[PDB]
C-alpha cells in the first residue's frame, strides 16, 4: 500500500486495501464490500481497451 513509502513494507490483502481508498473520498465500506464483482469487471474491461 502506502506503508512502504516511509518505513518498511507491511502486508495487507488487496480487497481490504481498496476500502481505505473508498473511505478516503467520502463513501463507506459496505458499498465496496457489496459490489466487488461489478467493480472488478469494470476495472478489467476499462484496462483492456
Amino acid at each position: 500500500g502506502w506503508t512502504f513509502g516511509a518505513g518498511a513494507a507491511l502486508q495487507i490483502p488487496f480487497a481490504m486495501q481498496m476500502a481505505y481508498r473508498f473511505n478516503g473520498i467520502g463513501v463507506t465500506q459496505n458499498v465496496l464490500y457489496e459490489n466487488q464483482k461489478l467493480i472488478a469487471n469494470q476495472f478489467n474491461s476499462a484496462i483492456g481497451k
Partner: protein, 64 residues
Amino acid sequence: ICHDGKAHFPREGVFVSNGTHWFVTQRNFYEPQIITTDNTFVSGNCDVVIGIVNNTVYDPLQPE
C-alpha cells in the same frame, strides 16, 4: 463478523485475532479492545460479504 444473522463492520480500526480471541484496534498502533455495539455499525444480511466470520457482540449496559 456475523452475529444473529447480521453483518457488523468496524467504525475506526481493523479486526484482528491472536488465535483464540477477536478484538479491534487502530491502524497505526497496537491497542486491543473487546468488541461491543458502540465501536461497530450494522448493515445488511449475512450472505453477501466474502470472508465473513462467526463471533459474538456484547451489549454494553442496556440489557445487563
